[PDB]
DNA sequence: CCGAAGCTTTCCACAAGATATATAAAGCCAAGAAATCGAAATACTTTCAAGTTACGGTAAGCATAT
């Protein structure tokens, strides 16, 4: 992911909407190294997390309403702290980075 | 009549030798098969590198309420 003349460190998504999303219909959630052979300027390490955190559907999103604090309480009540402990290994897509 | 120059081989002698059984106990040497075991190569288990994906850690620059 460094010292590579073929990678691009941009911030926006130039042609990423077509180069990266086609794999959704092409390959499964495995063998990401097959994708970088066709998409230039993108590395698999960042592409995995980009795909995951961009195409996820089940996330706690929206405005902080009068019912979300109970959701946070029941989330931190499942196993413990969750953010950095080992219990994050079983949390489905509830990684600490988010 | 004085002087000068030419022991290996091939056969008779016939009295011994040679090749022949025959037990017969005894161990060994000696070549041909049958059984046995050591070296190991073409294979199987496991070890060990080597890159690689699932799973996160902090941190930085932009949207919007007060």
UniProtKB/Swiss-Prot annotation:
Q: Which domain of life is it from?
A: Eukaryota
Portion annotated as DNA-binding: 32-55, 84-98
Q: Where in the cell is it found?
A: Nucleus
Question: Which part of the chain is the HTH myb-type domain?
Answer: 4-59, 60-98
UniProt disease link: Neurodevelopmental disorder with motor regression, progressive spastic paraplegia, and oromotor dysfunction: An autosomal recessive disorder characterized by delayed motor development and developmental regression after the first year of life, followed by progressive spasticity with gait alterations, paraparesis, and oromotor dysfunction. Most individuals have cerebral, cerebellar, or basal ganglia volume loss.
Subunit: Part of the SNAPc complex composed of 5 subunits: SNAPC1, SNAPC2, SNAPC3, SNAPC4 and SNAPC5. SNAPC4 interacts with SNAPC1, SNAPC2, SNAPC5, BRF2 and TBP.
Q: Function, please?
A: Part of the SNAPc complex required for the transcription of both RNA polymerase II and III small-nuclear RNA genes. Binds to the proximal sequence element (PSE), a non-TATA-box basal promoter element common to these 2 types of genes. Recruits TBP and BRF2 to the U6 snRNA TATA box.
Please state what the protein is called.
snRNA-activating protein complex subunit 4
Q: What gene is it encoded by?
A: SNAPC4
Q: Which residues of the full protein are shown?
A: 393 to 490 of 1469
């Amino acid at each position: 992911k460094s010292l590579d003349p073929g990678l691009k460190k941009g911030y926006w998504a130039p042609e990423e909407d077509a180069k990266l999303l086609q794999a959704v219909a092409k390959y499964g959630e495995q063998d990401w190294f097959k994708i970088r052979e066709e998409v230039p300027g993108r590395s698999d390490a960042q592409c995995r997390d980009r795909y995951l955190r961009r195409l996820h559907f089940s996330l706690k999103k929206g405005r902080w309403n009068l019912k979300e604090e109970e959701q946070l309480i029941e989330l931190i009540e499942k196993y413990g702290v969750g953010h950095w402990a080992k219990i994050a290994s079983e949390l489905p897509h509830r990684s600490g980075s988010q």
